[PDB]
Design a protein around this ligand. Structure first.
Ligand code: MVI
Ligand code: MVI
Ligand code: SAH
Ligand code: SAH
Ligand code: MG
Ligand code: MG
Lengths: 250, 250
Protein backbone atom coordinates (compact mmCIF):
# COMPACT_ATOMS: atom_id res chain seq x y z
CA UNK A 1 0.00 0.00 0.00
CA UNK A 2 1.60 3.20 -1.32
CA UNK A 3 0.89 6.69 0.02
CA UNK A 4 -1.48 7.38 -2.89
CA UNK A 5 -3.42 4.13 -2.35
CA UNK A 6 -3.72 4.82 1.38
CA UNK A 7 -4.88 8.41 0.84
CA UNK A 8 -7.56 7.52 -1.75
CA UNK A 9 -8.79 4.57 0.31
CA UNK A 10 -9.11 6.79 3.37
CA UNK A 11 -10.75 9.56 1.35
CA UNK A 12 -13.46 7.12 0.18
CA UNK A 13 -14.07 5.89 3.75
CA UNK A 14 -14.24 9.50 4.92
CA UNK A 15 -16.59 11.06 2.32
CA UNK A 16 -18.97 8.08 2.76
CA UNK A 17 -18.42 8.22 6.54
CA UNK A 18 -17.59 4.57 7.06
CA UNK A 19 -15.37 6.06 9.78
CA UNK A 20 -18.09 7.38 12.12
CA UNK A 21 -21.13 5.55 10.63
CA UNK A 22 -23.86 8.17 10.77
CA UNK A 23 -27.51 7.25 10.83
CA UNK A 24 -29.64 7.31 7.70
CA UNK A 25 -32.83 9.32 7.18
CA UNK A 26 -35.94 7.15 7.07
CA UNK A 27 -37.37 7.54 3.54
CA UNK A 28 -38.24 5.48 0.46
CA UNK A 29 -37.49 1.82 1.17
CA UNK A 30 -35.24 2.62 4.18
CA UNK A 31 -37.48 2.02 7.21
CA UNK A 32 -35.01 2.39 10.10
CA UNK A 33 -32.37 5.02 11.01
CA UNK A 34 -29.57 2.60 11.95
CA UNK A 35 -26.32 2.61 9.98
CA UNK A 36 -26.22 -0.65 7.98
CA UNK A 37 -22.84 -1.53 6.52
CA UNK A 38 -24.20 -3.23 3.38
CA UNK A 39 -26.43 -0.23 2.61
CA UNK A 40 -23.56 2.27 2.88
CA UNK A 41 -21.25 -0.04 0.88
CA UNK A 42 -23.70 -0.01 -2.06
CA UNK A 43 -24.87 3.63 -1.61
CA UNK A 44 -28.46 2.73 -0.84
CA UNK A 45 -29.20 4.87 2.22
CA UNK A 46 -29.70 8.61 2.91
CA UNK A 47 -26.85 9.67 5.20
CA UNK A 48 -27.69 12.20 7.91
CA UNK A 49 -24.09 13.49 7.94
CA UNK A 50 -21.91 11.87 5.23
CA UNK A 51 -20.74 14.07 2.36
CA UNK A 52 -21.78 11.56 -0.32
CA UNK A 53 -24.58 9.06 -0.67
CA UNK A 54 -23.10 7.11 -3.62
CA UNK A 55 -21.44 4.45 -1.51
CA UNK A 56 -18.18 2.54 -1.75
CA UNK A 57 -18.90 0.64 -5.01
CA UNK A 58 -19.71 3.85 -6.91
CA UNK A 59 -16.74 5.66 -5.29
CA UNK A 60 -14.55 2.78 -6.49
CA UNK A 61 -16.07 3.16 -9.96
CA UNK A 62 -15.34 6.90 -9.97
CA UNK A 63 -11.74 6.14 -9.00
CA UNK A 64 -11.44 3.54 -11.77
CA UNK A 65 -12.79 5.99 -14.36
CA UNK A 66 -10.58 8.89 -13.35
CA UNK A 67 -7.45 6.72 -13.01
CA UNK A 68 -8.13 5.07 -16.38
CA UNK A 69 -8.53 8.44 -18.06
CA UNK A 70 -5.25 9.66 -16.54
CA UNK A 71 -3.41 6.43 -17.41
CA UNK A 72 -4.65 6.36 -21.00
CA UNK A 73 -4.16 10.10 -21.63
CA UNK A 74 -7.85 10.78 -22.24
CA UNK A 75 -8.08 14.57 -22.30
CA UNK A 76 -10.42 16.66 -20.24
CA UNK A 77 -12.00 17.62 -16.98
CA UNK A 78 -14.31 15.82 -14.53
CA UNK A 79 -17.93 16.99 -14.29
CA UNK A 80 -20.52 15.85 -11.76
CA UNK A 81 -24.11 16.92 -12.35
CA UNK A 82 -25.97 16.55 -9.05
CA UNK A 83 -23.54 16.81 -6.16
CA UNK A 84 -25.58 17.10 -2.93
CA UNK A 85 -23.03 17.75 -0.14
CA UNK A 86 -20.14 17.38 -2.60
CA UNK A 87 -18.45 14.18 -1.42
CA UNK A 88 -18.08 12.53 -4.83
CA UNK A 89 -16.58 15.76 -6.26
CA UNK A 90 -14.32 16.09 -3.22
CA UNK A 91 -13.15 12.55 -3.91
CA UNK A 92 -12.57 13.38 -7.61
CA UNK A 93 -10.48 16.42 -6.68
CA UNK A 94 -8.55 14.19 -4.25
CA UNK A 95 -7.69 11.74 -7.03
CA UNK A 96 -6.19 14.55 -9.12
CA UNK A 97 -4.36 15.83 -6.03
CA UNK A 98 -2.95 12.36 -5.27
CA UNK A 99 -1.42 12.13 -8.75
CA UNK A 100 -0.29 15.81 -8.75
CA UNK A 101 -2.46 16.56 -11.79
CA UNK A 102 -2.48 20.34 -12.25
CA UNK A 103 -4.11 20.68 -15.70
CA UNK A 104 -7.58 19.26 -15.05
CA UNK A 105 -10.56 20.74 -13.20
CA UNK A 106 -13.42 19.21 -11.23
CA UNK A 107 -16.67 20.92 -12.22
CA UNK A 108 -19.38 20.85 -9.54
CA UNK A 109 -22.85 21.40 -11.01
CA UNK A 110 -26.06 21.62 -9.02
CA UNK A 111 -29.06 23.81 -8.43
CA UNK A 112 -27.79 23.96 -4.81
CA UNK A 113 -31.52 24.01 -4.02
CA UNK A 114 -32.55 20.33 -4.32
CA UNK A 115 -34.93 18.94 -6.95
CA UNK A 116 -37.01 21.40 -8.97
CA UNK A 117 -40.71 21.98 -8.53
CA UNK A 118 -42.60 20.08 -11.24
CA UNK A 119 -44.41 22.03 -13.97
CA UNK A 120 -46.26 21.14 -17.19
CA UNK A 121 -42.89 21.29 -19.00
CA UNK A 122 -41.75 18.11 -17.20
CA UNK A 123 -41.65 14.60 -18.67
CA UNK A 124 -44.70 12.67 -17.39
CA UNK A 125 -42.49 10.12 -15.56
CA UNK A 126 -40.74 12.97 -13.73
CA UNK A 127 -44.07 14.57 -12.90
CA UNK A 128 -45.41 11.30 -11.48
CA UNK A 129 -42.23 10.67 -9.40
CA UNK A 130 -42.17 14.26 -8.16
CA UNK A 131 -38.72 14.04 -6.56
CA UNK A 132 -39.24 17.57 -5.18
CA UNK A 133 -41.47 15.99 -2.52
CA UNK A 134 -38.37 14.37 -0.94
CA UNK A 135 -36.16 17.49 -0.61
CA UNK A 136 -36.62 18.04 3.13
CA UNK A 137 -36.91 14.34 3.98
CA UNK A 138 -33.34 13.53 2.91
CA UNK A 139 -31.83 17.00 3.49
CA UNK A 140 -31.23 17.44 -0.21
CA UNK A 141 -31.03 21.25 -0.56
CA UNK A 142 -27.39 22.07 0.10
CA UNK A 143 -26.08 25.52 -0.63
CA UNK A 144 -23.05 26.40 -2.68
CA UNK A 145 -21.43 27.90 0.42
CA UNK A 146 -21.98 24.62 2.34
CA UNK A 147 -20.46 22.59 -0.48
CA UNK A 148 -17.43 24.94 -0.61
CA UNK A 149 -17.10 24.63 3.17
CA UNK A 150 -17.07 20.85 2.84
CA UNK A 151 -14.29 20.93 0.24
CA UNK A 152 -12.22 23.18 2.50
CA UNK A 153 -12.47 20.71 5.41
CA UNK A 154 -10.46 18.21 3.32
CA UNK A 155 -7.98 20.90 2.16
CA UNK A 156 -9.30 20.46 -1.37
CA UNK A 157 -10.96 23.82 -2.15
CA UNK A 158 -8.68 25.39 -4.77
CA UNK A 159 -8.69 26.78 -8.33
CA UNK A 160 -9.06 23.26 -9.81
CA UNK A 161 -12.58 23.11 -8.37
CA UNK A 162 -15.12 25.20 -10.26
CA UNK A 163 -18.83 25.53 -9.50
CA UNK A 164 -21.79 25.69 -11.90
CA UNK A 165 -24.81 26.80 -9.83
CA UNK A 166 -28.21 26.58 -11.46
CA UNK A 167 -30.65 24.24 -13.17
CA UNK A 168 -28.84 22.04 -15.71
CA UNK A 169 -31.00 23.26 -18.60
CA UNK A 170 -29.61 26.74 -17.88
CA UNK A 171 -25.99 25.97 -16.93
CA UNK A 172 -24.94 23.15 -19.25
CA UNK A 173 -25.28 24.61 -22.75
CA UNK A 174 -22.71 27.36 -22.09
CA UNK A 175 -20.68 25.83 -19.23
CA UNK A 176 -17.13 26.96 -19.96
CA UNK A 177 -15.40 23.52 -20.08
CA UNK A 178 -14.09 22.44 -23.49
CA UNK A 179 -13.54 18.71 -22.91
CA UNK A 180 -14.47 16.08 -20.33
CA UNK A 181 -12.70 12.82 -19.45
CA UNK A 182 -15.42 11.78 -16.95
CA UNK A 183 -19.08 12.83 -16.99
CA UNK A 184 -20.84 11.72 -13.83
CA UNK A 185 -24.62 12.15 -13.94
CA UNK A 186 -26.52 12.06 -10.65
CA UNK A 187 -29.70 14.11 -11.14
CA UNK A 188 -32.20 11.19 -10.91
CA UNK A 189 -34.83 12.47 -13.36
CA UNK A 190 -35.46 12.13 -17.09
CA UNK A 191 -35.08 15.89 -17.33
CA UNK A 192 -31.78 16.23 -15.51
CA UNK A 193 -30.33 13.23 -17.36
CA UNK A 194 -31.50 14.41 -20.80
CA UNK A 195 -30.38 17.98 -20.04
CA UNK A 196 -26.85 16.80 -19.29
CA UNK A 197 -26.54 14.20 -22.02
CA UNK A 198 -27.80 16.73 -24.55
CA UNK A 199 -25.55 19.59 -23.51
CA UNK A 200 -22.46 17.99 -21.92
CA UNK A 201 -22.00 14.55 -23.49
CA UNK A 202 -20.81 15.95 -26.84
CA UNK A 203 -17.77 17.29 -24.95
CA UNK A 204 -16.88 13.85 -23.52
CA UNK A 205 -13.59 12.74 -25.09
CA UNK A 206 -13.29 9.43 -26.87
CA UNK A 207 -12.02 7.02 -24.21
CA UNK A 208 -13.90 9.03 -21.59
CA UNK A 209 -16.48 7.69 -19.16
CA UNK A 210 -20.19 8.40 -18.83
CA UNK A 211 -21.55 7.40 -15.41
CA UNK A 212 -25.29 7.13 -14.76
CA UNK A 213 -25.74 7.06 -10.99
CA UNK A 214 -29.51 6.60 -11.03
CA UNK A 215 -30.06 4.03 -13.79
CA UNK A 216 -32.36 2.05 -11.50
CA UNK A 217 -34.91 4.91 -11.75
CA UNK A 218 -37.20 4.32 -14.77
CA UNK A 219 -37.28 8.01 -15.81
CA UNK A 220 -33.49 8.21 -15.81
CA UNK A 221 -33.18 4.98 -17.79
CA UNK A 222 -35.75 6.28 -20.30
CA UNK A 223 -33.56 9.32 -20.97
CA UNK A 224 -30.45 7.21 -21.33
CA UNK A 225 -32.00 4.94 -23.95
CA UNK A 226 -33.67 7.78 -25.86
CA UNK A 227 -30.37 9.64 -26.03
CA UNK A 228 -28.32 6.60 -27.04
CA UNK A 229 -30.87 5.64 -29.74
CA UNK A 230 -30.87 9.18 -31.13
CA UNK A 231 -27.09 9.30 -31.40
CA UNK A 232 -26.44 5.70 -32.43
CA UNK A 233 -24.48 4.99 -29.25
CA UNK A 234 -23.96 1.26 -28.68
CA UNK A 235 -21.12 1.34 -26.11
CA UNK A 236 -21.66 -1.44 -23.55
CA UNK A 237 -23.64 -0.41 -20.45
CA UNK A 238 -21.73 -1.86 -17.48
CA UNK A 239 -23.44 -2.28 -14.14
CA UNK A 240 -21.67 -1.02 -10.98
CA UNK A 241 -24.07 -1.91 -8.15
CA UNK A 242 -27.84 -1.98 -7.66
CA UNK A 243 -28.24 1.66 -8.84
CA UNK A 244 -25.48 2.80 -11.13
CA UNK A 245 -24.09 1.96 -14.52
CA UNK A 246 -21.50 3.43 -16.89
CA UNK A 247 -20.14 3.21 -20.37
CA UNK A 248 -16.88 4.16 -22.01
CA UNK A 249 -17.17 6.32 -25.11
CA UNK A 250 -15.64 4.60 -28.13
CA UNK B 1 1.85 17.18 -1.94
CA UNK B 2 3.01 13.54 -1.90
CA UNK B 3 0.68 10.59 -1.33
CA UNK B 4 2.13 10.05 2.14
CA UNK B 5 1.71 13.70 3.12
CA UNK B 6 -1.89 13.69 1.86
CA UNK B 7 -2.73 10.46 3.66
CA UNK B 8 -1.30 11.58 7.03
CA UNK B 9 -2.91 15.02 6.74
CA UNK B 10 -6.28 13.40 6.02
CA UNK B 11 -5.81 10.87 8.81
CA UNK B 12 -5.28 13.69 11.34
CA UNK B 13 -8.38 15.55 10.13
CA UNK B 14 -10.36 12.32 10.32
CA UNK B 15 -9.38 10.98 13.77
CA UNK B 16 -9.98 14.48 15.21
CA UNK B 17 -13.15 14.80 13.09
CA UNK B 18 -12.37 18.14 11.58
CA UNK B 19 -14.25 16.62 8.63
CA UNK B 20 -17.71 16.36 10.21
CA UNK B 21 -17.18 18.62 13.26
CA UNK B 22 -19.04 16.78 15.98
CA UNK B 23 -20.35 18.57 19.06
CA UNK B 24 -18.42 18.61 22.32
CA UNK B 25 -19.66 17.45 25.68
CA UNK B 26 -20.38 20.37 28.02
CA UNK B 27 -17.89 19.83 30.86
CA UNK B 28 -14.96 21.50 32.61
CA UNK B 29 -14.37 24.91 31.03
CA UNK B 30 -16.42 24.08 27.89
CA UNK B 31 -19.81 25.79 28.43
CA UNK B 32 -21.58 25.07 25.09
CA UNK B 33 -21.91 22.01 22.80
CA UNK B 34 -21.12 23.67 19.47
CA UNK B 35 -18.00 22.65 17.59
CA UNK B 36 -15.36 25.40 17.91
CA UNK B 37 -12.49 25.19 15.42
CA UNK B 38 -9.91 26.73 17.76
CA UNK B 39 -10.83 24.28 20.55
CA UNK B 40 -10.50 21.19 18.32
CA UNK B 41 -7.27 22.57 16.79
CA UNK B 42 -5.67 22.69 20.27
CA UNK B 43 -7.42 19.58 21.66
CA UNK B 44 -9.31 21.41 24.40
CA UNK B 45 -12.83 20.02 23.99
CA UNK B 46 -14.51 16.67 24.71
CA UNK B 47 -15.66 15.26 21.36
CA UNK B 48 -18.98 13.46 21.30
CA UNK B 49 -17.89 11.36 18.31
CA UNK B 50 -14.24 11.94 17.28
CA UNK B 51 -11.76 9.12 17.88
CA UNK B 52 -9.19 11.39 19.60
CA UNK B 53 -9.42 14.41 21.91
CA UNK B 54 -5.76 15.48 21.56
CA UNK B 55 -6.33 17.92 18.71
CA UNK B 56 -4.35 18.94 15.65
CA UNK B 57 -1.29 20.45 17.42
CA UNK B 58 -0.74 17.28 19.47
CA UNK B 59 -1.40 15.08 16.42
CA UNK B 60 1.23 17.13 14.58
CA UNK B 61 3.61 16.60 17.51
CA UNK B 62 2.99 12.84 17.45
CA UNK B 63 3.76 12.80 13.72
CA UNK B 64 6.94 14.82 14.27
CA UNK B 65 8.12 12.42 16.99
CA UNK B 66 7.38 9.25 15.03
CA UNK B 67 8.83 10.62 11.76
CA UNK B 68 11.95 11.83 13.58
CA UNK B 69 12.48 8.43 15.21
CA UNK B 70 12.08 6.67 11.84
CA UNK B 71 14.35 9.20 10.07
CA UNK B 72 17.09 9.03 12.70
CA UNK B 73 16.94 5.24 13.15
CA UNK B 74 15.87 5.42 16.81
CA UNK B 75 14.96 1.83 17.64
CA UNK B 76 11.69 0.73 19.17
CA UNK B 77 7.95 0.68 19.26
CA UNK B 78 5.31 3.33 19.94
CA UNK B 79 3.36 3.15 23.22
CA UNK B 80 0.40 5.29 24.21
CA UNK B 81 -0.77 5.04 27.80
CA UNK B 82 -4.34 6.31 27.94
CA UNK B 83 -5.98 5.90 24.55
CA UNK B 84 -9.73 6.57 24.98
CA UNK B 85 -11.35 5.78 21.58
CA UNK B 86 -7.94 5.03 20.04
CA UNK B 87 -7.55 7.88 17.53
CA UNK B 88 -4.00 8.90 18.47
CA UNK B 89 -2.87 5.21 18.29
CA UNK B 90 -4.76 4.78 15.00
CA UNK B 91 -2.84 7.79 13.69
CA UNK B 92 0.47 6.31 14.95
CA UNK B 93 -0.25 3.01 13.16
CA UNK B 94 -1.10 5.04 10.04
CA UNK B 95 2.29 6.77 10.12
CA UNK B 96 4.03 3.37 10.17
CA UNK B 97 1.72 2.17 7.37
CA UNK B 98 2.48 5.25 5.24
CA UNK B 99 6.22 4.60 5.40
CA UNK B 100 5.75 0.80 4.96
CA UNK B 101 7.42 0.14 8.33
CA UNK B 102 6.91 -3.55 9.14
CA UNK B 103 9.27 -3.95 12.14
CA UNK B 104 7.62 -1.70 14.74
CA UNK B 105 4.47 -2.10 16.82
CA UNK B 106 1.95 0.36 18.21
CA UNK B 107 1.10 -0.61 21.78
CA UNK B 108 -2.32 0.51 23.00
CA UNK B 109 -2.51 0.60 26.80
CA UNK B 110 -5.62 1.46 28.78
CA UNK B 111 -7.91 0.19 31.50
CA UNK B 112 -10.59 0.29 28.76
CA UNK B 113 -12.94 1.40 31.52
CA UNK B 114 -12.01 5.02 32.25
CA UNK B 115 -10.36 6.42 35.35
CA UNK B 116 -10.05 4.23 38.45
CA UNK B 117 -12.06 4.83 41.59
CA UNK B 118 -9.94 6.67 44.16
CA UNK B 119 -8.56 4.62 47.09
CA UNK B 120 -6.47 5.40 50.18
CA UNK B 121 -3.31 4.46 48.23
CA UNK B 122 -3.75 7.41 45.83
CA UNK B 123 -1.63 10.58 45.83
CA UNK B 124 -3.51 13.37 47.67
CA UNK B 125 -3.65 15.52 44.50
CA UNK B 126 -5.24 12.60 42.61
CA UNK B 127 -7.74 12.09 45.43
CA UNK B 128 -8.68 15.78 45.38
CA UNK B 129 -9.04 15.83 41.55
CA UNK B 130 -11.00 12.59 41.52
CA UNK B 131 -10.93 12.14 37.72
CA UNK B 132 -13.25 9.11 38.12
CA UNK B 133 -16.11 11.61 38.65
CA UNK B 134 -15.96 12.58 34.94
CA UNK B 135 -16.04 9.11 33.36
CA UNK B 136 -19.61 9.04 32.08
CA UNK B 137 -19.88 12.81 31.53
CA UNK B 138 -17.28 12.79 28.73
CA UNK B 139 -17.85 9.17 27.64
CA UNK B 140 -14.38 8.06 28.78
CA UNK B 141 -14.95 4.32 29.34
CA UNK B 142 -14.32 2.73 25.96
CA UNK B 143 -13.98 -1.02 25.70
CA UNK B 144 -11.17 -2.92 24.03
CA UNK B 145 -13.68 -4.25 21.49
CA UNK B 146 -14.79 -0.69 20.61
CA UNK B 147 -11.20 0.43 20.22
CA UNK B 148 -10.44 -2.56 17.96
CA UNK B 149 -13.57 -1.76 15.95
CA UNK B 150 -12.36 1.80 15.50
CA UNK B 151 -8.95 0.68 14.18
CA UNK B 152 -10.73 -1.64 11.72
CA UNK B 153 -12.78 1.24 10.27
CA UNK B 154 -9.51 2.80 8.99
CA UNK B 155 -8.16 -0.57 7.79
CA UNK B 156 -5.43 -0.34 10.42
CA UNK B 157 -6.22 -3.27 12.74
CA UNK B 158 -3.40 -5.76 12.14
CA UNK B 159 -0.59 -7.61 13.95
CA UNK B 160 1.44 -4.38 14.35
CA UNK B 161 -1.20 -3.18 16.80
CA UNK B 162 -1.02 -4.78 20.23
CA UNK B 163 -3.25 -4.07 23.24
CA UNK B 164 -2.34 -3.90 26.93
CA UNK B 165 -5.64 -3.94 28.83
CA UNK B 166 -5.57 -3.10 32.53
CA UNK B 167 -4.43 -0.55 35.09
CA UNK B 168 -0.93 0.73 34.26
CA UNK B 169 0.46 -0.36 37.63
CA UNK B 170 -0.42 -3.94 36.58
CA UNK B 171 0.35 -3.89 32.84
CA UNK B 172 3.48 -1.79 32.54
CA UNK B 173 6.12 -3.64 34.57
CA UNK B 174 5.87 -6.81 32.46
CA UNK B 175 4.52 -5.34 29.18
CA UNK B 176 6.30 -7.43 26.55
CA UNK B 177 8.00 -4.64 24.52
CA UNK B 178 11.80 -4.38 24.69
CA UNK B 179 12.38 -0.87 23.36
CA UNK B 180 10.35 2.29 22.65
CA UNK B 181 11.04 5.12 20.22
CA UNK B 182 7.99 7.12 21.34
CA UNK B 183 6.31 6.99 24.75
CA UNK B 184 3.09 8.99 24.75
CA UNK B 185 1.58 9.45 28.21
CA UNK B 186 -2.05 10.53 28.41
CA UNK B 187 -3.37 9.22 31.75
CA UNK B 188 -3.87 12.64 33.47
CA UNK B 189 -3.11 11.69 37.09
CA UNK B 190 0.01 11.64 39.24
CA UNK B 191 -0.55 7.91 39.59
CA UNK B 192 -0.88 7.06 35.92
CA UNK B 193 2.05 9.30 34.97
CA UNK B 194 4.32 7.92 37.70
CA UNK B 195 3.28 4.32 36.89
CA UNK B 196 4.28 4.75 33.25
CA UNK B 197 7.43 6.78 33.82
CA UNK B 198 8.58 4.26 36.41
CA UNK B 199 7.87 1.15 34.40
CA UNK B 200 8.07 2.16 30.71
CA UNK B 201 10.49 5.11 30.48
CA UNK B 202 13.60 2.98 31.11
CA UNK B 203 12.80 1.23 27.80
CA UNK B 204 12.73 4.51 25.83
CA UNK B 205 15.70 4.55 23.47
CA UNK B 206 18.18 7.40 23.47
CA UNK B 207 16.90 9.81 20.81
CA UNK B 208 13.35 8.67 21.64
CA UNK B 209 10.50 10.98 22.60
CA UNK B 210 8.54 11.27 25.84
CA UNK B 211 5.24 13.09 25.38
CA UNK B 212 3.24 14.31 28.37
CA UNK B 213 -0.27 15.06 27.14
CA UNK B 214 -1.63 16.41 30.42
CA UNK B 215 1.25 18.55 31.71
CA UNK B 216 -1.20 21.37 32.44
CA UNK B 217 -2.68 19.22 35.23
CA UNK B 218 -0.83 19.89 38.52
CA UNK B 219 -0.86 16.21 39.60
CA UNK B 220 0.64 15.08 36.29
CA UNK B 221 3.29 17.83 36.39
CA UNK B 222 4.18 16.86 39.98
CA UNK B 223 4.90 13.30 38.81
CA UNK B 224 6.94 14.50 35.87
CA UNK B 225 9.19 16.66 38.03
CA UNK B 226 9.54 14.06 40.79
CA UNK B 227 10.58 11.46 38.22
CA UNK B 228 13.01 13.73 36.39
CA UNK B 229 14.62 14.85 39.67
CA UNK B 230 14.98 11.26 40.86
CA UNK B 231 16.72 10.19 37.65
CA UNK B 232 18.72 13.34 36.98
CA UNK B 233 16.88 14.02 33.73
CA UNK B 234 17.50 17.54 32.41
CA UNK B 235 16.29 17.13 28.79
CA UNK B 236 14.48 20.32 27.74
CA UNK B 237 10.71 20.28 28.25
CA UNK B 238 9.17 21.69 25.04
CA UNK B 239 5.64 23.00 25.05
CA UNK B 240 3.28 21.81 22.27
CA UNK B 241 0.03 23.69 22.99
CA UNK B 242 -1.86 24.75 26.13
CA UNK B 243 -1.84 21.18 27.55
CA UNK B 244 0.99 19.04 26.26
CA UNK B 245 4.75 19.02 26.40
CA UNK B 246 7.50 16.64 25.37
CA UNK B 247 11.19 15.99 25.68
CA UNK B 248 13.69 14.02 23.66
CA UNK B 249 15.82 11.59 25.63
CA UNK B 250 19.52 12.46 25.37
C1 MVI C 1 -36.41 9.16 -0.75
C2 MVI C 1 -35.80 9.72 -2.02
C3 MVI C 1 -35.98 8.80 -3.22
O1 MVI C 1 -37.32 8.24 -3.12
C4 MVI C 1 -37.51 6.91 -3.23
O2 MVI C 1 -36.62 6.10 -3.14
C5 MVI C 1 -38.92 6.61 -3.49
C6 MVI C 1 -39.38 5.38 -3.63
C7 MVI C 1 -40.80 4.99 -3.90
C8 MVI C 1 -41.57 4.90 -2.58
C9 MVI C 1 -40.81 3.63 -4.70
O3 MVI C 1 -42.19 3.26 -4.87
C10 MVI C 1 -42.66 2.15 -4.13
O4 MVI C 1 -42.05 0.96 -4.60
C11 MVI C 1 -42.45 -0.21 -3.86
C12 MVI C 1 -41.61 -1.36 -4.36
C13 MVI C 1 -43.94 -0.43 -4.04
C14 MVI C 1 -44.71 0.82 -3.59
N1 MVI C 1 -46.19 0.78 -3.69
C15 MVI C 1 -46.72 0.41 -5.00
C16 MVI C 1 -46.84 0.03 -2.61
C17 MVI C 1 -44.17 2.08 -4.29
O5 MVI C 1 -44.77 3.23 -3.72
C18 MVI C 1 -40.09 3.62 -6.05
C19 MVI C 1 -39.94 2.19 -6.57
C20 MVI C 1 -40.75 4.51 -7.11
C21 MVI C 1 -39.98 4.67 -8.44
C22 MVI C 1 -40.72 5.59 -9.40
C23 MVI C 1 -38.57 5.20 -8.22
O6 MVI C 1 -37.59 4.55 -8.57
C24 MVI C 1 -38.44 6.51 -7.56
C25 MVI C 1 -37.24 6.95 -7.16
C26 MVI C 1 -37.05 7.95 -6.14
C27 MVI C 1 -35.88 8.39 -5.71
C28 MVI C 1 -35.74 9.42 -4.63
C29 MVI C 1 -34.44 10.22 -4.72
O7 MVI C 1 -33.43 9.32 -4.26
C30 MVI C 1 -32.36 9.13 -5.14
O8 MVI C 1 -32.28 7.76 -5.46
C31 MVI C 1 -31.17 7.45 -6.33
C32 MVI C 1 -31.33 6.00 -6.75
C33 MVI C 1 -29.87 7.73 -5.58
O9 MVI C 1 -28.74 7.49 -6.39
C34 MVI C 1 -29.83 9.19 -5.17
O10 MVI C 1 -29.55 10.01 -6.32
C35 MVI C 1 -31.10 9.62 -4.44
O11 MVI C 1 -31.11 11.04 -4.34
C1 MVI D 1 -14.06 17.31 32.30
C2 MVI D 1 -12.88 16.36 32.41
C3 MVI D 1 -11.61 17.03 32.89
O1 MVI D 1 -12.00 18.00 33.91
C4 MVI D 1 -11.58 19.28 33.80
O2 MVI D 1 -11.08 19.74 32.81
C5 MVI D 1 -11.81 20.01 35.06
C6 MVI D 1 -11.48 21.28 35.19
C7 MVI D 1 -11.66 22.13 36.42
C8 MVI D 1 -13.00 22.85 36.34
C9 MVI D 1 -10.46 23.14 36.52
O3 MVI D 1 -10.70 23.98 37.65
C10 MVI D 1 -10.90 25.35 37.37
O4 MVI D 1 -9.67 25.97 37.02
C11 MVI D 1 -9.82 27.35 36.66
C12 MVI D 1 -8.47 27.83 36.18
C13 MVI D 1 -10.36 28.13 37.84
C14 MVI D 1 -11.68 27.51 38.31
N1 MVI D 1 -12.41 28.22 39.39
C15 MVI D 1 -11.78 28.14 40.71
C16 MVI D 1 -12.77 29.60 39.05
C17 MVI D 1 -11.49 26.02 38.61
O5 MVI D 1 -12.75 25.43 38.91
C18 MVI D 1 -9.05 22.54 36.59
C19 MVI D 1 -7.99 23.60 36.30
C20 MVI D 1 -8.76 21.82 37.91
C21 MVI D 1 -7.39 21.14 37.99
C22 MVI D 1 -7.24 20.32 39.27
C23 MVI D 1 -7.17 20.26 36.76
O6 MVI D 1 -6.29 20.53 35.97
C24 MVI D 1 -8.09 19.11 36.56
C25 MVI D 1 -8.10 18.42 35.41
C26 MVI D 1 -9.20 17.60 34.98
C27 MVI D 1 -9.27 16.94 33.83
C28 MVI D 1 -10.46 16.12 33.41
C29 MVI D 1 -10.13 14.99 32.44
O7 MVI D 1 -9.90 15.63 31.19
C30 MVI D 1 -8.63 15.43 30.63
O8 MVI D 1 -7.97 16.68 30.56
C31 MVI D 1 -6.67 16.60 29.94
C32 MVI D 1 -6.03 17.96 30.10
C33 MVI D 1 -6.86 16.17 28.49
O9 MVI D 1 -5.62 16.08 27.81
C34 MVI D 1 -7.53 14.81 28.44
O10 MVI D 1 -6.61 13.79 28.85
C35 MVI D 1 -8.83 14.82 29.25
O11 MVI D 1 -9.35 13.50 29.37
N1 SAH E 1 -32.43 19.85 -13.02
C1 SAH E 1 -31.50 19.96 -12.06
N2 SAH E 1 -30.55 20.91 -12.14
C2 SAH E 1 -29.58 21.08 -11.23
N3 SAH E 1 -29.49 20.29 -10.15
C3 SAH E 1 -30.38 19.27 -9.96
C4 SAH E 1 -31.46 19.03 -10.92
N4 SAH E 1 -32.18 17.99 -10.47
C5 SAH E 1 -31.59 17.55 -9.33
N5 SAH E 1 -30.54 18.34 -9.02
C6 SAH E 1 -29.62 18.12 -7.89
O1 SAH E 1 -29.19 16.77 -8.09
C7 SAH E 1 -28.72 16.22 -6.83
C8 SAH E 1 -29.22 14.79 -6.68
S1 SAH E 1 -28.41 13.91 -5.35
C9 SAH E 1 -26.70 13.88 -5.83
C10 SAH E 1 -25.89 12.93 -4.94
C11 SAH E 1 -24.39 13.23 -4.95
N6 SAH E 1 -23.77 12.91 -6.27
C12 SAH E 1 -23.64 12.45 -3.89
O2 SAH E 1 -22.45 12.23 -4.05
O3 SAH E 1 -24.19 12.02 -2.87
C13 SAH E 1 -29.22 17.18 -5.76
O4 SAH E 1 -28.11 17.88 -5.17
C14 SAH E 1 -30.15 18.14 -6.49
O5 SAH E 1 -30.13 19.50 -6.02
N1 SAH F 1 -4.26 4.08 35.92
C1 SAH F 1 -4.74 3.87 34.67
N2 SAH F 1 -4.52 2.71 34.01
C2 SAH F 1 -4.96 2.48 32.76
N3 SAH F 1 -5.69 3.39 32.08
C3 SAH F 1 -5.98 4.60 32.64
C4 SAH F 1 -5.51 4.92 33.99
N4 SAH F 1 -5.93 6.17 34.29
C5 SAH F 1 -6.59 6.63 33.20
N5 SAH F 1 -6.64 5.68 32.24
C6 SAH F 1 -7.19 5.88 30.90
O1 SAH F 1 -6.52 7.04 30.41
C7 SAH F 1 -7.31 7.63 29.33
C8 SAH F 1 -7.30 9.14 29.49
S1 SAH F 1 -7.95 10.00 28.06
C9 SAH F 1 -6.86 9.55 26.75
C10 SAH F 1 -7.11 10.38 25.48
C11 SAH F 1 -6.53 9.73 24.21
N6 SAH F 1 -5.05 9.71 24.20
C12 SAH F 1 -6.97 10.45 22.94
O2 SAH F 1 -6.28 10.32 21.93
O3 SAH F 1 -7.98 11.16 22.91
C13 SAH F 1 -8.69 6.98 29.42
O4 SAH F 1 -8.95 6.12 28.30
C14 SAH F 1 -8.66 6.18 30.72
O5 SAH F 1 -9.34 4.94 30.67
MG1 MG G 1 -27.98 9.09 -7.38
MG1 MG H 1 -4.83 14.17 27.83
Amino acid sequence: STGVELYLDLLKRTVSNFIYQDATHVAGLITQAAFVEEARESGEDYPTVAHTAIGMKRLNNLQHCVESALRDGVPGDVLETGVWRGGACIFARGILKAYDVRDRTVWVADSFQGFPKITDDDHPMDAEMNLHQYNAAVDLPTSLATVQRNFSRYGLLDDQVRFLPGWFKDTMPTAPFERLAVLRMDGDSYGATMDVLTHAYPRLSPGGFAIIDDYCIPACREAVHEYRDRHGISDEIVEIDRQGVYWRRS
